[PDB]
Design a protein around this ligand. Sequence first.
Ligand SMILES: [Cu+2]
Ligand SMILES: [Cu+2]
Lengths: 620, 620
Amino acid sequence: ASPFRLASAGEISEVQGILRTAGLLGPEKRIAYLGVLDPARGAGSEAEDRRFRVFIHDVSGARPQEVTVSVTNGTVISAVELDTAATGELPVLEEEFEVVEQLLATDERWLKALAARNLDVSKVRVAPLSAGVFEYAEERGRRILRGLAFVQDFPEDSAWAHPVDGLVAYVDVVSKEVTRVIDTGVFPVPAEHGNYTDPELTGPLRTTQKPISITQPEGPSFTVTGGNHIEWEKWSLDVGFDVREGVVLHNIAFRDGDRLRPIINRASIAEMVVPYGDPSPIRSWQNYFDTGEYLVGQYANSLELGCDCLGDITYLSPVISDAFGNPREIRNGICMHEEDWGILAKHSDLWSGINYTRRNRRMVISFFTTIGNYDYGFYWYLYLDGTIEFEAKATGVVFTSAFPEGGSDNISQLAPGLGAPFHQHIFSARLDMAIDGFTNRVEEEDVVRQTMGPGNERGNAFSRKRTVLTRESEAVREADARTGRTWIISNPESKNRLNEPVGYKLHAHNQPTLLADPGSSIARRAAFATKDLWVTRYADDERYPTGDFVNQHSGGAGLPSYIAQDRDIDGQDIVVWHTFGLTHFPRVEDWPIMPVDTVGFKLRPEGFFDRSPVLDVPAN
Amino acid sequence: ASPFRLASAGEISEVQGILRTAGLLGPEKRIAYLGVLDPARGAGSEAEDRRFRVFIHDVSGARPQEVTVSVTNGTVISAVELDTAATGELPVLEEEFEVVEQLLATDERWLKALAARNLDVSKVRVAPLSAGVFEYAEERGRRILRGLAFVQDFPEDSAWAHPVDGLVAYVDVVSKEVTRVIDTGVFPVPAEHGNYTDPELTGPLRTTQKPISITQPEGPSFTVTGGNHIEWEKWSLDVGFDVREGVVLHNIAFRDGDRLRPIINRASIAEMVVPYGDPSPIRSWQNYFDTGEYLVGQYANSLELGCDCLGDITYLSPVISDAFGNPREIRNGICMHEEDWGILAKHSDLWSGINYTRRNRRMVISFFTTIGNYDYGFYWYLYLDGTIEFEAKATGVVFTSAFPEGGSDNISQLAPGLGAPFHQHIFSARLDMAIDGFTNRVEEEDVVRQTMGPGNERGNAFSRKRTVLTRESEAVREADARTGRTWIISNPESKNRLNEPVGYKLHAHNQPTLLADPGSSIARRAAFATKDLWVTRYADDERYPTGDFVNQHSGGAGLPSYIAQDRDIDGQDIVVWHTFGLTHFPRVEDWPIMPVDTVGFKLRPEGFFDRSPVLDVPAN
Ligand SMILES: [Cu+2]
Ligand SMILES: [Cu+2]
């Protein structure tokens, strides 16, 4: 009867019934977000209260509502009218994707622009892109999408190969009006196709790959109980799923002898931003918060055995709500399997004659999502030795433009006339820490160079230093690869047998953070992305680094607002927010469909155990 | 009849015969190094000349010799007497390992030191450590090893758990004399054992791991011809083995349509340094060049199926020479296999309805070596998409000391009284580039931030810049993770279909480089380790970043000497030397045997192909 179980179809159907009976879900209403709430701190209240948070959009133009319901008692707990001109718009609705294209196909400004290019309107696909906040005063308080156009020569053609440059339009999707059509000039529409299943492009398929067969003759080493509770090789955790964040990990704990030791209370990718670095007015507004604006969980793929997931695979099929409150299953949306991971430890000793070798393994929990041209894999790994790792795998088709004549400093050429603007993919991991319990602190650890001198006569010594972050106002930290900078999360009140506080070390990849000018709109709205590491004091309502309503919010919400409270974080219930990402200068090899690139982070124990935790691993 | 084939037993036996007949391999002589020479530039000389380089040590104290022989003609090509006080000593001989311990067991200064500690001399193991170059004038021109002591309570005990601190001795191994015994004071010998196969330490072994079965029902997708030539998924290369460097990769090329395109002429780990950061006089001299001083190839493990290498494995068994010129096979010393590597590319398109997924694969070529307490895995990976990656896996037992009372800034405590000095493991990859041929150049590529202003009104733009390295004097480069700095090796004379030079991008991990003071002995001898990237003009005799004779060389040889020639490298036959390593602050979890930690680098194509090279990969 776990309070962390996945939402079921019945629960979502009950939410729909509660909302209807209360007068909050009539025919003009649409569910823009629905998700279970985590239990409050202190689950000592016997019998859970399963509560759901709902964002309700109104297609007639009335103010949207934030609603909290209790499925256990069948009641609405609170319902607030939202002022979107102040606190932001609701997430983009799937049913609004196609509205941008159909409104434009009857606008005389759009039709004139296509006529000048000799384009047939029935072939022109329009991408529904989030709008952000810029200089247009008339957009404040309106639900706006912007559209960029692509030509599809036939229904199975890859539109991405034929961008229509110099053209962009703004659309009010509630009142169904085209507010602006901007035409800066005619660019040739790149003519080459990018159809990666066309034999004339692929050539004959290779016949040289022989099968790799991965099987587990006795089944997998993990167990799944209660729908979503996993036990594997001393690890214990609950796999949750949220329509906004996707896969969420709860209650990550490690069985050290007879005691179950907490490590991480909740782990998630709480935000995602893709800023574009092309100064053209056609695209200079382009930034997508795939998590906060589009909800990456609702676009999760059904993963196919032997193709997306290879081996002995256990699936979860999470349930989300559609825009009317009906339950919708994402079949095979989450893959879980263990896999071989090479040598764990090895030594051949000259003096004792003992030869020792052990294999490593990792548990894999993953899902894939597709938002327009992009596809992202999210991978959580648990290792035998206590290491936790996250990996994002980026692929799909690159977003394209024309490639200007005479060149560009902000676009690379993929094909004759075909460009791909420079951009970043930046992630925010939110790690609600519980190292051996909830009294935690973070230290920044730097390598220390020492000078040749007395007490260091041969000039060989080096050391390290640790700086405790004591208040939120000093807990906004930058990477420093040169000094080997890492961060340790420790529990000052739980000691290992050497009398040191137990800890975990965060190892970052030290990739560049947000490159946009600090005075830009995106730097205000994506402030979390300007620094590598933030630490806050836990609070129930501080869930996203960008705030609750990212769509068309003017900036400053989320982490900078939280940090300003300057709360005590030295030995407290704390949350670590780690920013990491990829800076993408597209290459020719990324076209017409791009090979996976990856980024991530990991946490390794740092005096958490009293000795290696994998001494009891057998030889096999 | 490849000139790059592995040396055979017959060839080594013929070298021994040639050397004997010439009067160069009498009973007082020992082969300290023997290896095949690569062909000269321009193999248009029909019928190869298989030539071998040999370092001949003389145990009676005569000057050592460097000898080059031609096995094809049965002749000595050149023989030079070496002046070791000028150009360095020969590599450590395996038969000199045990000499340090036996000389000390009859030295009255050593015996007195053990008596004060109540240690039984028959239980005291002495590690034969390379000496380096410091203040001791009497060592110039002498072959010296230094010894640190460990107690072995019984023949199967792990001596590493019982370091004898405060004691060190220097030994002349040719004249068999103890030159110095230094006793700075008594430390308790840590008492806890570190026996990781002892049930009282491991507890009962886990019964929860079920088997993972990896098989290839039709065999592997690669072919091996001529002993060591590999073809796999458009890749082509020769796997070489050198007693000093270990696994060497030759002639890495990629089949792009009908043409075979060179990428890398020769790839190797050309040096390895492990500097210790403990200022105690007992250990402040401690630096090991495992490659240059000990020769990591001669310590390669025989790798066991299902334990070290899992799957459908093809083995190579390289042949090296022992100290008398007899051939010695390292059975199953090299593992090669392919393995599954997750998603290669994936896209689900909203407009075309096409769902596309492809798997990735990598070819693995690896060996493991053991030098005293350390064990290192060297892993080369070839990927379907043109990526080449190297990974070093570090494990074994950490080098120990006493942990001082009152603490230390340069040692961490692993166990009551047991310390592990801080240290680094730093590698030098030597990449003789041949991107589409031999006319290559290197550019340093940095991310460029742009200011909000005219032509960037929304402050979103960012760019990149590339700086060509034109002469060796400007080709000593530092990492800069903050600006995303990478290096591109291109061929200015070979263009892709977009009229840009073809290239490969080097992605570093940006870990710290050598931390020792720049005035130290180790900074002079390991100068390559002070910078991340060096580029030289190819020359036949510039093989190692530290020079040919690293043992007891005073400093400056190798890369700093090469660089000083200030040769033209803009569109020339060039060599890239990349420094990368791990900075190791040992943790409790590293004891009593440490879980693998890793470091490496990779190279990805950068406009080398005209589109993605994996369009022809099938679905499976
Ligand atoms: Cu990208
Ligand atoms: Cu180490």
